[PDB]
């Protein structure tokens, strides 16, 4: 689990710092490769960031902003690839790392291994305690095809800086220590060489290496230019298919592999979609739809079959919240591609408020591919039961890039997400819900699908208070796990279910309309089965599955009346056909 996803929060204040630190830790601890963006913002003076130690690779941009920490241990960060860029220009942005309007603020970038930026520049502004930043030969770190990269570095301070250690080859370091010298890997090489470990031809890295190397060959790179194929840097992964040399039929390559980030993988990671093209993604490629085989992307046979979009997608890409202008856009939808967010502006902006009953559109919703975010929600509604049949929030898109379920500041008394069995990825953040019990009631363990996931939770109704009012799970709920009060909110029913009510026994032996049991569901015996005494009443739903007929039998069926096709009661009660026409 060298691999995590980053976040996509930019400069946004976390709704709660307490949880912000926990998320950061959960997200990054043990992580070596960040897919997406490494964003470290609003971190207090007292913050232990050792969980960051192991990061060697950042696919998107790195942003260290609005922090009071004196240091962030990214000493092992080797390459940032700049796949996405901050303010569309920057692969590394270090901003406003100094106290609110001893003392606080980041002192030294400490990026001693940072030896490759593939795309995008560097933005270092308003860092009052920060020294050294203007000492680095960015020219070296930027890739050969990235010199045109923007660099905008501010050296206004608030402490007087001493020069780099005399031990550092030119003026160049990441910090004060003889251990902090910039090692140069591009400007210092023999002939037309992209990367090296020293001034000699023999010091030259393979052409497939990205940040330096420890030897001359494609197995010795500090990072891959493109793809890491089983510890060997390669331009591209092996194709999922070989072609017949005469016919050109697809033949499976046993060596074939999918590209996941800058890696070659035998199988897409759990929550990603496999492509026909041999890649792993989170949205399908053009004229390609998803199917379940696990989840693949294929070519649409007939022209791509239309779909229902959530926020973050299509005409709703730059749309904030679900509002009275777009809510009916979800009428009838089983599956929303993208997200749903309810914010104050959703209810009480001159824009007409969502009335609670409009919300009912979501009754058919079973899957959100994106996230679910709730930061306002009708007082009159005690739960999320409009989402009762929501089975799976996949989190291929994450609120702030971090959370796939968010519930904050809501008024709700319980969750009622009684169908939800998966949080594909992302974290769950349930904070500041005054009256909300039945949170530590849900076996979060079971919804999560990777170890980077957890439930982050504060300022909801204190648990002893919930019990003090007598608000536990119902008896009939297996293992004390539920989404809210009463026999309809169990995670797994411990006995039998009639409809959606978890019940003690089905009416198999006793009780007004008799029943049989199919996989723990109580289903009605056909009304024409004679309820039996001391024995079962039927074997299934049909009128030929009775032990005995309540009235007559037109074999194989028990029936109310003989049909009048004109038939008449036998003496034994079975319908014979009338002999006259």
């Amino acid at each position, epitope marked *: 689990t060298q691999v995590c996803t980053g976040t996509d929060m930019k400069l946004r204040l976390p709704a709660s710092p307490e949880t912000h630190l926990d998320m950061l830790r959960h997200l990054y601890q043990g992580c070596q490769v960040v897919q997406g963006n490494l964003e470290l913002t609003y971190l207090p003076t007292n913050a232990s960031l050792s969980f960051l130690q192991d990061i060697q690779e950042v696919q998107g941009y790195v942003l260290i902003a609005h922090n009071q920490v004196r240091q962030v241990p990214l000493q092992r960060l080797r390459i940032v690839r700049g796949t996405q860029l901050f303010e569309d220009n920057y692969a590394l942005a270090v901003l406003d790392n100094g106290d609110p309007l001893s003392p606080g603020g980041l002192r030294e970038l400490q990026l001693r291994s940072l030896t490759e930026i593939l795309k995008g520049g560097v933005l270092i502004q308003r860092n009052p305690q920060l020294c050294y930043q203007d000492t680095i030969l960015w020219k070296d770190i930027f890739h050969k095809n990235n010199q045109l990269a923007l660099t905008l570095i501010d050296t206004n301070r608030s402490r007087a800086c001493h020069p780099c250690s005399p031990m550092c080859k030119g003026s160049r370091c990441w910090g004060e220590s003889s251990e902090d010298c910039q090692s140069l890997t591009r400007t210092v090489c023999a002939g037309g060489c992209a990367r090296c470990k020293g001034p000699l031809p023999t010091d030259c890295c393979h052409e497939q290496c990205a940040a330096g190397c420890t030897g001359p060959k494609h197995s010795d790179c500090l990072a891959c230019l493109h793809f890491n194929h089983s510890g060997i840097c390669e331009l591209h992964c092996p194709a999922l298919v070989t072609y017949n040399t005469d016919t050109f039929e697809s033949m499976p390559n046993p060596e074939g592999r999918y590209t996941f980030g800058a890696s070659c993988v035998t199988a897409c990671p759990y929550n990603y979609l496999s492509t026909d093209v041999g890649s792993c993604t989170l949205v399908c490629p053009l004229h390609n739809q998803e199917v379940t085989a696990t989840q693949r992307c294929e070519k649409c046979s007939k022209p791509c079959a239309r779909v229902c979009y959530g926020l973050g997608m299509e005409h709703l890409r730059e749309v904030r919240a679900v509002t009275s202008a777009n809510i009916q856009e979800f009428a009838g939808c089983k599956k929303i591609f993208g997200s749903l967010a309810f914010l104050p502006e959703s209810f009480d902006s001159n824009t007409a408020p969502l009335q609670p009953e409009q919300l009912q559109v979501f009754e058919t919703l079973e899957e959100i591919t994106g996230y679910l975010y709730i930061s306002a929600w009708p007082d009159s509604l005690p739960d999320l039961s409009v989402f009762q049949n929501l089975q799976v929030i996949r989190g291929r898109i994450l609120h702030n890039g971090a959370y796939s379920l968010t519930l904050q500041g809501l008024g709700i008394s319980w969750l009622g997400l009684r169908s939800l069995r998966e949080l594909g990825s992302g974290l769950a953040l349930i904070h500041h819900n005054t009256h909300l019990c039945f949170v530590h009631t849900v076996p979060w363990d079971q919804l999560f699908r990777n170890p980077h996931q957890a439930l982050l939770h504060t300022a909801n109704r204190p648990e002893d208070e919930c019990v003090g009012e007598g608000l536990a799970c119902h008896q009939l709920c297996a293992r004390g796990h539920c989404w809210g009060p009463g026999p309809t909110q169990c995670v797994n029913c411990s006995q039998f279910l009639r409809g959606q009510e978890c019940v003690e026994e089905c009416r198999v032996l006793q009780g007004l309309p008799r029943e049989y049991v199919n996989a723990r569901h109580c289903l009605p015996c056909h009304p024409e089965c004679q309820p039996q005494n001391g024995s079962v009443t039927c074997f299934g739903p049909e009128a030929d599955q009775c032990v005995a007929c309540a009235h007559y*039998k037109d*074999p*194989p069926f028990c029936v109310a009346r003989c049909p009048s*096709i004109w038939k008449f009661p036998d003496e034994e009660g079975a319908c014979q*056909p009338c002999p006259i026409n």
Partner: antibody, heavy 120, light 108 residues
Framework: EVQLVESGGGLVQPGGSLRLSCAAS????????IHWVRQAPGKGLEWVAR????????RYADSVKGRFTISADTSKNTAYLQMNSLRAEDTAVYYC?????????????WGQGTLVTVSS | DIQMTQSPSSLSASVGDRVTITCRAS??????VAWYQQKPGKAPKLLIY???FLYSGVPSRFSGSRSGTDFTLTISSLQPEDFATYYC?????????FGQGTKVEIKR
């Protein structure tokens, strides 16, 4: 005339699947039970499955339960037998039949049959 | 699971003959018994239902009776077209079951 047409017959590899189809013509399948009945070469008639399309309630012979799946598509007026995990025992002519009528539980109409032949 | 024992498994009769085909039910089946005729490479066709009722457009030469659990198909004046396999079926319970069939051959 009422009419029931089987299709989908042909060679299956042992272990393989196959989907038989029965298009009804001249009555609605929702109004009755549809059975599939099969006949190995030179052997008797063997009831396989029945479906009641109004509610999709099914019943199955022991020799097929878990492999074969009966189903209906009311819009297409068509019944199906989804035959999974076939073996040489299963080589037979598959007919489709109804219990035409609501107090008439004899099989009044039958399709022409499709030969399924299970073989490597 | 109601079994239907059909005998004989095959018979030879000539044109004009009165042929009889029996079938015993393993348990009580009331009147829920049907008779089918299958001809070389054809679907079976229904002859008799509810034990003794001539189906629409079947020659009156075909007759069915019950005598307890024994059920009898009678072809009363065998004709050449009557060359076929004949099958009782019970539908008293589900599953419905077929007899083994009895082959009628014509002696000319």
């Amino acid at each position: 005339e009422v009419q029931l047409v089987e299709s989908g017959g042909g060679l299956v590899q042992p272990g393989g699947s196959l989907r038989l189809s029965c298009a009804a013509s001249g009555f609605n399948i929702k109004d009755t039970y549809i059975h599939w009945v099969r006949q190995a070469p030179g052997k008797g008639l063997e009831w396989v499955a029945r479906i009641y399309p109004t509610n999709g309630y099914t019943r199955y012979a022991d020799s097929v339960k878990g492999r074969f799946t009966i189903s209906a598509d009311t819009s297409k007026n068509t019944a199906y037998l989804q035959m999974n995990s076939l073996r040489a025992e299963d080589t037979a002519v598959y007919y489709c039949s109804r219990w035409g009528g609501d107090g008439f539980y004899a099989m009044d109409y039958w399709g022409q049959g499709t030969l399924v032949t299970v073989s490597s | 699971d109601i079994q239907m024992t059909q005998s004989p498994s095959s018979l030879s009769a000539s044109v004009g003959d009165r042929v009889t085909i029996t079938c015993r039910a393993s348990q009580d089946v009331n009147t829920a018994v049907a008779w089918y005729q299958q001809k070389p490479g054809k679907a079976p066709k229904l002859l008799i239902y509810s034990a003794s009722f001539l189906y629409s457009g079947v020659p009156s030469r075909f007759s069915g009776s019950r005598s307890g659990t024994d059920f009898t198909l009678t072809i009363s004046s065998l004709q050449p077209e009557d060359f076929a396999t004949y099958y009782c079926q019970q539908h008293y319970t589900t599953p419905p079951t077929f007899g083994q069939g009895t082959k009628v051959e014509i002696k000319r």
